[PDB]
């Protein structure tokens, strides 16, 4: 009634927030998953990195999980907060 049915995508806000919460919960409490975020912490906190740091970070992330899993390159740019996500599933192997 308020939005003239333009707010229909907000009908499941509780369920989507619950699913996000569940995904965060299994994000810290899974083996071969939390150390990837720890590596992200080390990469983000330690700035002024060259390219070779980026490739060794890539294979160090790869070595944590299985050889058949999928990698995702979620690029962030401070200027413009533009998150480009790239599909490199079984590409760097």
């Amino acid at each position: 009634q308020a939005y003239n049915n333009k707010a229909f995508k907000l009908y499941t806000i509780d369920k989507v927030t619950q699913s996000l919460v569940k995904h965060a919960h299994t994000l810290m409490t899974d083996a071969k998953t939390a150390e990837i975020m720890a590596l992200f912490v080390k990469d983000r906190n330690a700035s002024t990195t060259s390219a070779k740091d980026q490739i060794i970070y890539r294979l160090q992330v790869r070595s944590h999980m299985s050889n058949t899993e999928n990698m995702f390159r979620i690029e962030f740019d401070k200027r413009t907060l533009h998150v480009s996500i790239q599909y490199i599933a079984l590409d760097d192997l």
């Binding site: 990837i36 990195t49 980026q54 740019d77 998150v83 996500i85």
Partner: peptide, 25 residues
């Protein structure tokens, strides 16, 4: 080839962090 004061930051992730970030977006 040192990139000082970097602005583009890369997150490498499996399906779990990707799906979590997709739900956030």
């Amino acid at each position: 080839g040192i990139i000082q004061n970097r602005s583009i930051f890369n997150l490498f992730a499996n399906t779990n962090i990707y799906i979590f970030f997709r739900h956030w977006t």
